[PDB]
Design a protein around this ligand. Structure first.
Ligand code: GTP
Ligand code: GTP
Ligand code: GDP
Ligand code: GDP
Ligand code: MG
Lengths: 32, 426, 409, 426, 427
């Protein structure tokens, strides 16, 4: 059960990081 | 002109097809007795794609029911839109496979597949310019999966140039009805990767989940789930039946969403889907349709697309709408969520607009994303398959029927090399 | 004197469905059009909308050609597999259309290169027309895909493979995008939610303004053979930016004071080009100005002087007389349900420059990226093609880029 | 174009917001069904600020209800104008905090606030140009104070460049509904001074005083209190919805009334507010609105400003008025009582006029004063906080949830230096 | 000859609503834009019988612009002229000068260019703004900066509204006035001040209106502009142009601040019982009970004065009347200037608009003078601006937008230097 919690935490962190990355990419496109 | 022959297999195929012919007959304005009673002119000129004029305005569907148990045939014949089929098209065995893929693929199929092929041939050459065949079946059952799969292989041997659609449901461990689901689904996919043209993957978890969350139904019987699947199938072949500002046939969608020949497993979604209590609290605009389309909690598969990347995507729109709004919305979702899309492919979204909405609605949409998140289920299945096959559970029920150990190893091999190629292209 | 028009594809005949509506509404002057047309497509859905439409009796039944099944956004399918059975029937009709004619100025073709029918059998029709007549002009008004606004996925493959034949077959090729026209309808026509119908209506305005010199008597007439000399300085450089003025609504038109000086200016700003490209990066090789309606030669003469003396835009070092004017007397007509107000005078400018060299370069990367990984190539190869023609069409556009850079210097 | 998304938290927030949406919808001529039935074209020009057109005249409010117990949600859908809210905007927990700021800010907030954030995101991106957010809540309860304050902090780090109004009633010893009021108020104010752009102090004690003397009501239920608060909220944002001779937007008010980033606690009053027995004997001119505005017994807080000094003040007038009269009245009340005003700022009063009165009156006004006397509440609350915390009363319900002791000491220090810093500029 | 008029801010375009109202009612044009050649200075002709004004309304808040789009004159103004932003500067000079100004002034410029290109003999521009706000102050100064670099030699008549000494509506307006004048100093060629309390007192005493709104204020401002452009629009016995004021009234390139007044502002009843001639209106134009800026020229010394005369006025008595003023000793002129007057007479009387509270007078005088009493107002502003700046009140809003503490001190000492400049020319 412990490893299951690790899975559902790492994906959520991974998801937040991917969303931040998209924001940065969008800003570069607008600024260029 | 362009022709679609319908083939339904097994209990799942028959009941899904029953609801399908209900909604298509209403769209073309045909009564349960078989005679035209519609109002608009538009509903007459494109009924040959699905019907045949017999005599005295009797339009009979171009369908083939196929199973091994009479309960499904009698339930079909009993209900409304049951007396519109030709009784000769109810090709029907007698013994029954019963969730044994070997029975439906080697023993019992061997005496039925001859009769179905006779009917489908006579029904195929009856029309002039065939567009393709349309099959609805399952991958957990025996007479649906095994016989339907064998029928797919024989058909692709005879007609190798014609198109082929397969609406197939796959089993998931959260909704697991039979015990031998992995043994069936793994072998069934082995044949689907080499025989079908494209497969629109379905599942019951997402369907039950959709009716809970978005539709907020209380008792979602199979009728409502089959109603949703039918609405998807009507949306995918609305371009042939009605004029639009931009048309996209079956072949047109296939070439724009399949970048490599073995990468033909899709996810499907339908919009708009709203609760009955909130149907009047909403607008009907293209941006609203797009927000509900690209929601990951709206696919009709239990595979979250945000767990991977989209290779391509498709949006078939129906209704009087401005094409500019269509392209701007597709471009907007292509720029803001840049990481979820593949990089060495710009323009991962093909779009199309038809001018006739489904009956009762103003504007609808159908989404077909070819993502690389679909590989989780194949891994989600293969881990179960190995769990049984490491220790030969239930294996003798198939071995004493003809399958040898090399067949299961081959099915694992094809499953494993497939999940690696999805992982490669992500 | 007559000129016949061919329309290919979903985009081609919808453009024609608006273009012919304008011709009938506009009309011995009719002799050049009355129709001398041919619609042809692989999907019967859009042609048979015409067969049951309001213009049932207007078109002779045979004219509306229609195949059995679509090429499905597949250049190879619409050029090798399915084209081969319908193109012969089409051109063996167009011949007897020309035999009906006596003083044929030329043909004019309407196609979009993104699709399979507009691109594939477009080029196929063009190749048999070039070997059959050779000398007679064939004006091709094509629709290239936009850089950022796009509806298909494999359209880079189609656009490159179509261009390789559009070079040496058509005589005068006018680019038209969809984003640029969308921007025009958003900016000037203030239509925030446009559809394909509005685009096709103002495309017809451009076509009508360049054939009105044949149809009606003006102060300075200009034939189709005139564009052949006055705008293409080299046999393989014929790709024209288009513009129009005044594109204006019904209320704004009355408020503003439309004249010759300011519309000659407005037809030169990049805010009014029909192709998404910035001619500030390029240098004008030649310009052509069709004036319709209430025009005296003095103010058009004065207007080209002010353009030459401005420095916001530059010309090539080769042409001091870098213009070709043309004046016609009859004003542009209006269509009920159309959005353009009635104007005493309008200007359709067709130029040639090196800004077009940017669109090809922009196109190259998108095609290059997909081709390197061999995306979608298996569809075209199984249709009948090979890896040879993909790579060789690629190097043809590479040569064209160096060509524009060399001539622009 | 300029847009306000509305957020209601807890039981206090839900009743306040309920009577608020009735008042605005009645001003814009929208019936309980939610369809337009007004007459003037002026009422349609500025409905984008608070509503979205759905279909066929259906206007839905741009509000989000957020709570923890379903009694408030069902009480909202029961009453009139209850059928206008979109049912999806009822984002909602199930367990209940129950007057425990730690339960409202650490345990139940951690799983509900992602949901309420997602609704707010959709509501913010659904519109084009945000003017600000509007949050109504209390400071004594738990599900309003702790959760709402966490929502404020989360939103401020998301959209930092937009305004934000929060209308908060605060506890007082004379109206003491719960026992842990200071432990909730002190921690809530600590977060408000560092997150919110501007706050509008309210209290229930002053509202009861208003209903006794000015309204002369027999039975002042909560409906009338919410009626007064709603009239104030409509009065301040009237400038964005209607044109006038001198328009003053929310940002224009914020920069004109806040001299220093920590001095953003205002006391509010509204005029005219008279009993039905004396409403017949009254006149409607500018001086009679002012001398009822600037009366100390009309403020909606229990902080008498003449026990302090005015930094700045503002009046928002509604109705066809003469701007000369408006300015000379502000001049008169500032010249006579010069001691009550700050000295190093001349012309302490910002004034504005709008040309649309509320229905039922010919001329009205709304006063917003940023005095320094608001520190009476901070000392008045902090001593009760100290009286329990010196002896560790009720502490374990806060401590055993995740909070430690330095949180209370830091909160004490920040509240204490805040009342100290108000006193220095005084 | 043509002159175009630009309006910035809430007060700016409201003033324009009264001006163009007065203009069409003077030249006999209905609000829709058609007649039932002197209109060429302000209206361009479509050639289809429609006349369009040479003006652009622009601001940052869409409220005041869109009632104009739907009033009676929906069809008079060309749509592109009525520029409008999306959100307000909110009484914040920096926000209008750097944050939001930088996006909107470039659209105004590429508009105003084709207004000038349609013109042939452009006399100049004339701008309307109130310095108390953020739009009229911030992007107004920014617009003047870019106008000076574009044209330079063309006149820019600035009719500005300064904040009143005691009657004020905003609280950060001292900051806005000082920073705005810092650039209005070296850009505007001729800048006319129009206070608000002075106009309030005129409507209270002269027009005997005890309850005036902004409508009457804007009405009489349009009357002064009409009296000032009649010399350009119509022929008289002795006319001046807009380039005349550049030379004849400002002795030094930094002293350009004029006190305006107009006479006779008389209600409908006094005119019936009272007499109009040139001598008494020449008197009434000088008394401080009729000035448009709260200052007293009795405390100052005149450099040069200007006198617009409208209606049935002969030139012999304007000379005799100005002679009587010089022989009086209540007002005195600077030692360096022996002659201090610039007179002008035009034939057309001021027309009246229905609904206004101005009577139909036979003759009128519009006086525009320059003095040193204007130095007292600027000093009066410095006391209360410096009052709050030392403690750094309200500075955090402007510095948070992207400014610093440097520009306050450097703008402060520049206008402080101007104080010393005014005192040394008066000696
Ligand atoms: N301007 C304009 N462009 C159109 C119109 N219809 C389609 N297009 C363009 O056509 C391109 C795709 O080709 P289509 O004409 O739609 O289809 P096709 O050329 O006949 O090729 P197939 O789909 O294989 O039949 C798109 O990129 C559109 O931009 C139209 O009505 N007006
Ligand atoms: N004379 C006169 N002054 C006016 C009028 N309307 C507003 N004002 C003045 O304008 C000043 C404030 O500026 P406004 O024009 O109202 O607002 P703004 O300049 O656009 O600045 P923002 O409010 O930030 O948009 C006030 O001090 C008023 O004195 C008017 O009709 N006549
Ligand atoms: N959506 C849907 N799924 C069905 C229906 N009937 C059966 N299934 C699914 O089919 C699977 C069993 O397939 P089965 O009916 O035994 O196939 P067959 O025996 O080969 O005909 C189960 O997982 C069910 O969830 C139906 O009417 N609708
Ligand atoms: N003005 C007003 N105040 C209310 C109303 N209902 C509750 N309150 C106030 O709410 C305070 C208690 O907060 P509570 O409702 O328990 O907040 P919550 O539990 O966080 O939602 C009391 O001091 C009441 O004065 C109402 O209808 N109107
Ligand atoms: Mg096509």
């Amino acid at each position: 059960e412990a490893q299951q919690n690790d899975i559902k935490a790492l994906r959520r962190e991974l998801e937040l990081k991917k969303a931040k990355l998209n924001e940065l990419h969008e800003d570069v496109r607008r600024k260029e | 002109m362009r022709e679609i022959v319908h083939i339904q297999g097994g209990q799942c195929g028959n009941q899904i097809g029953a609801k399908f012919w209900e909604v298509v007959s209403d769209e073309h304005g045909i009564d349960p007795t078989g005679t035209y009673h519609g109002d608009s002119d538009l509903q007459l000129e494109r009924i040959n794609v699905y019907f045949n004029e017999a005599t005295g305005g009797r339009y009979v569907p171009r369908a083939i029911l196929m199973d091994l148990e009479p309960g499904t045939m009698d339930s079909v014949r009993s209900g409304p839109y049951g007396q519109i089929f030709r009784p000769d098209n109810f090709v029907f065995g007698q013994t029954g496979a019963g969730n044994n893929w070997a029975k439906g693929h080697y023993t019992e199929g061997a005496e039925l597949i001859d009769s179905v092929l006779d009917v489908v041939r006579k029904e195929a050459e009856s029309c002039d310019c065939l567009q393709g065949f349309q099959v609805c079946h399952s991958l957990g059952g025996g007479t649906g999966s095994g016989m339907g799969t064998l029928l797919i292989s024989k058909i692709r041997e005879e007609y190798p140039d014609r198109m082929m659609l397969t609406f197939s449901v796959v089993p998931s461990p959260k909704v697991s009805d039979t015990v031998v689901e992995p043994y069936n689904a793994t072998l069934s996919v082995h044949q689907l990767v080499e025989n079908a043209d494209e497969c629109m993957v379905l599942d019951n978890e997402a369907l039950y989940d959709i009716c809970f969350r978005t539709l907020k139904l209380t008792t979602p019987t199979f009728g409502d789930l089959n109603h949703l699947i039918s609405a998807v199938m009507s949306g995918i072949t609305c371009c042939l039946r009605f004029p639009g500002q931009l048309n996209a046939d079956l072949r047109k969608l296939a070439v724009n969403l399949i970048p490599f020949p073995r990468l033909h497993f899709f996810m499907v979604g339908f919009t708009p889907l709203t609760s009955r209590g909130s149907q009047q609290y909403r607008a009907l605009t293209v941006p609203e349709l797009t927000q509900q389309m690209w929601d990951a909690k709206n696919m009709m598969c239990a595979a979250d697309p945000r767990h991977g990347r989209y290779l391509t995507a498709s949006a078939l729109f129906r209704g009087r709408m401005s094409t500019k709004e269509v392209d701007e919305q597709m471009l907007n979702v292509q720029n803001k969520n840049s990481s979820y899309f593949v990089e060495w492919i710009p323009n991962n979204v093909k779009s199309s607009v038809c001018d006739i909405p489904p009956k009762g609605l103003k504007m609808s949409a159908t989404f077909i994303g070819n993502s690389t998140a679909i590989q989780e289920m194949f891994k989600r299945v293969s881990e179960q398959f190995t769990a049984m096959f490491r220790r030969k559970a239930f294996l003798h029920w198939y071995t004493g029927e003809g399958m040898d150990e090399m067949e299961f190893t081959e099915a694992e091999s094809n499953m494993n090399d497939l999940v690696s190629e999805y992982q490669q292209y992500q | 004197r007559e000129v016949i028009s061919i329309h290919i594809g979903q985009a081609g005949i919808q453009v024609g469905n608006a273009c012919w509506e304008l011709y009938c509404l506009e009309h011995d002057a009719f002799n050049t059009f009355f129709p001398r047309c041919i619609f042809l497509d692989l999907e019967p859905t859009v042609v048979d909308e015409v067969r049951t439409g309001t213009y049932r009796q207007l078109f002779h039944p045979e004219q509306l050609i229609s195949g059995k099944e679509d090429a499905a956004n597949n250049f190879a399918r619409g050029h090798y597999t399915i084209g081969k059975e319908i193109v012969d029937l089409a051109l063996d009709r167009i011949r007897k259309l020309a035999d009906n004619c006596t003083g044929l100025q030329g043909f004019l073709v309407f196609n979009a290169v993104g699709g399979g029918t507009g691109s594939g059998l477009g080029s196929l029709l063009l190749e048999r027309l070039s070997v059959d007549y050779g000398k007679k002009s064939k004006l091709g008004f094509t629709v290239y895909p936009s850089p950022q606004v796009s509806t298909a996925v494999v359209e880079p493959y189609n656009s490159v493979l179509s261009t390789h034949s559009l070079l040496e077959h058509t005589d005068v090729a006018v680019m038209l995008d969809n984003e640029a026209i969308y921007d025009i309808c958003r900016r000037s026509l203030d239509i925030e939610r446009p559809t394909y119908t509005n685009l096709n209506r103002l495309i017809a305005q451009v076509i009508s303004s360049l054939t009105a010199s044949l149809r009606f008597d003006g102060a300075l007439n200009v034939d189709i053979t005139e564009f052949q000399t006055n705008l293409v300085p080299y046999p393989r450089i014929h790709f024209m930016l288009s513009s129009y003025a005044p594109i204006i609504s019904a209320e704004k038109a009355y408020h503003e004071q439309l004249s010759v000086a300011e519309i000659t200016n407005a037809a030169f700003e990049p805010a009014s080009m029909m192709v998404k490209c910035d001619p500030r990066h390029g240098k004008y090789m030649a310009c052509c100005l069709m004036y319709r309606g209430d025009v005296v030669p003095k103010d058009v003469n004065a207007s080209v002087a002010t353009i030459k003396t401005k420095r916001t835009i530059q010309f090539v070092d080769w042409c001091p007389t870098g213009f070709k004017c043309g004046i016609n007397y009859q004003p542009p007509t209006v269509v009920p349900g159309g959005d353009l107000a009635k104007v005493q005078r309008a200007v359709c400018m067709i130029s040639n420059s090196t800004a077009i060299g940017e669109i090809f370069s922009r196109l190259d990367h998108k095609f290059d990226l997909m081709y390197a990984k061999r995306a979608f190539v298996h569809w075209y190869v199984g249709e009948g093609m090979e890896e040879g023609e993909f790579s060789e069409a690629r190097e043809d556009l590479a040569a064209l880029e160096k060509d524009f850079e060399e001539v622009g210097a």
